Design a protein around this ligand. Sequence first.
Ligand SMILES: O=c1oc2c(O)c(O)cc3c(=O)oc4c(O)c(O)cc1c4c23
Ligand code: NA
Ligand code: NA
Ligand code: NA
Lengths: 267, 244, 99, 201
Amino acid sequence: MRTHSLRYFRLGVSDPIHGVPEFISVGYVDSHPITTYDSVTRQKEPRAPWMAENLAPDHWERYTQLLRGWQQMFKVELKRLQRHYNHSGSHTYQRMIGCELLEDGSTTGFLQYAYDGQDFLIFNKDTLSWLAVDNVAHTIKQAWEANQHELLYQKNWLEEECIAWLKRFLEYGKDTLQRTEPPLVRVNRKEVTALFCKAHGFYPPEIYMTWMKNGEEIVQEIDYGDILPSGDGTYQAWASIELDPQSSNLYSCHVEHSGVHMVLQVP
Amino acid sequence: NAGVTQTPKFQVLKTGQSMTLQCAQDMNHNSMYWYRQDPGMGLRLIYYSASEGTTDKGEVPNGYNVSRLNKREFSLRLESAAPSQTSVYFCASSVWTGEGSGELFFGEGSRLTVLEDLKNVFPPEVAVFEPSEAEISHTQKATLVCLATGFYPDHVELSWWVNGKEVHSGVCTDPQPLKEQPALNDSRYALSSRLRVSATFWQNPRNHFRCQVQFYGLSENDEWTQDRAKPVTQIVSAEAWGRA
Amino acid sequence: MIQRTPKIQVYSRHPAENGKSNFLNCYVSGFHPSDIEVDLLKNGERIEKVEHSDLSFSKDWSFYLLYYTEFTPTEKDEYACRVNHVTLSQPKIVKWDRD
Amino acid sequence: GQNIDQPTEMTATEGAIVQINCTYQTSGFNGLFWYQQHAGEAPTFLSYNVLDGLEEKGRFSSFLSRSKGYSYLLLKELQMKDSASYLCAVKDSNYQLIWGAGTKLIIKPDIQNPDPAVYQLRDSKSSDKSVCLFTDFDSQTNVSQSKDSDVYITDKCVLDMRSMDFKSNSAVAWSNKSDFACANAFNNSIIPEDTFFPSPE
Ligand SMILES: O=c1oc2c(O)c(O)cc3c(=O)oc4c(O)c(O)cc1c4c23
Ligand code: NA
Ligand code: NA
Ligand code: NA
């Protein structure tokens, strides 16, 4: 089984523009949205059909009420941050929590907060402590770290509850999450002359492409495209290296994807 | 710092009647709950309020409804009282809901009895009995006893008053009342209580003892058609003086 | 806050051969904060039927979005993506370099 | 099917140790709470366990094994003020509390100088009842309910005269029956053999 992760994201905005919501929260299983809530709908709803089809209205009803409580908790917490920063205008506050089931069976877990898109507090569930980036964060840490019970709760949740949910969702969504769609990899030349290694049509989006020269990993000489959504459930990417006019070389594209390795030599 | 203030502490209702239970908390909490305690079962949630601006049902919402009036108050409403709603009701609050470790803070409880007829409501007869002389000689201590008999429903508070001030040192009142006829589903109750004082204290003749039962029963608005007196909320008492 | 400006990438769902229906994708990512405006252009005019994904969250706390429209490329037609943000002094336009 | 199961009632002795079990079968687990509820009063929070192990809070410790679905509350050096119900509650995968039925803890007082006796109390001019008091016996005695329908007998009750650091057990019998006497009031109970019955006048 490949690596899988579950994540929940919260975003709050102190002075949102007309329409723009002040609170949003989205869940992901790997790269798929599975849940959404926001301060305008005020309803939690699946963004995945295999979610909607496997959880009864009682679940959405229950989590709708919780998110209405969390929205308010966020409103309050962001009010507090902005006043201890002495900041005017609109500012943002964010949370992320979740876990990974790695391929070998071991697990990871993580929880952190952001202010204005930079790290604010990061949890370490092994020392049972918070890391603070500035003195506004330091004051939240002394407060949060005094409820030894509440940190014990986070460690239990990240390690047992998160992993349990993720196992449950992997089964609901397995036809999506556990399929393999191998990539279609070609090569071509572009004006200096460049070798572009293009792949497309593949799922999951975890793929490694690299150019090798004469059996050595040309690196710092490689130029990596990003992995991009195609719009239909699959992804494309590329990597380019720059050809030498003065000496021939044996260039070859290497692609790894879901336990399969691919090599295209350039004649 | 009042904590969780809910009212009334006692109530007698007739089948089909209406009633609202008040609940307030001065602790700036966000979540508030309405629970129902019954013999032999764990607590059962009726309605809850995760934050000001939202309520939702619990395990047992039928026959009830609620209003989160503001951040402080959360009212529970019966609208056609029914016998099965006879129960003790506890309002509660926490700082947030959906946190993990947050404890609940409870109100004092509200005790409701729902009856088909009111022709079974009765105030308690209260009598005071004085120490055995045999006891004083043998142990150098004097035990007065108070009996409150034939009341229904079981809505009573028994206190002892010594020289005009309430006392608790030396008292033992029954934790549960006694059904005067166990076989009957509506039997009336007896309750006993005990004050033990030193022989010396009992033998001063200006020392004055009074046993007091506060009964919560009917009110002005309830209809009464029986021949006996209307069993209104009332205080029944009995007394004794020391004997040299 | 530190405001991050969006990376703008214009591409087709499949390799586009002239005359063959396809999908034109503008993927906008890495920006912060989350207010954003995106338009697909045909020869400089805004396309009406343009579908888009929900706002998305990255681990590094920035946001991504995918704007797409079905289309059929031709030799003559030129397609662009027009993005606007608070870090952008005026609109930014990115042509779809088929090559 | 979520359930919490705790024992209905327990009896220990004053000054001893008691250990109250709570086993749970839940849909997920976010914490197990212990609450204390004195009779007639409101439950109050005692302890919280979410990881494994034991935590100490004064005279009370509380234990948790997540693997076994099991927690106990351990009360050391028992005191009469510890008589109450103990309620265990578990947060499930959806953060909603599931409540056990509660354990009634009964504390037998340590009676140092037993002096069991039954006394006739003085009649009241305002009542037709005669009233007997069984009193000053050891905690090992149990008091039985009346067998005659017009005799009423209360269960036992512990009084504390704090001025003299003295504690006594007692139970009351009464009736308006002509044939009623103290010498025969508690005849359906196994009372100590040395029980004082003062001459009746
Ligand atoms: O069980 C959880 O479900 C969630 C959702 O279903 C959701 O939509 C958003 C969230 C979210 O933001 O934060 C969470 C936590 O911090 C947590 O400890 C547990 C949960 C969620 C959560
Ligand atoms: Na790559
Ligand atoms: Na706590
Ligand atoms: Na993600």
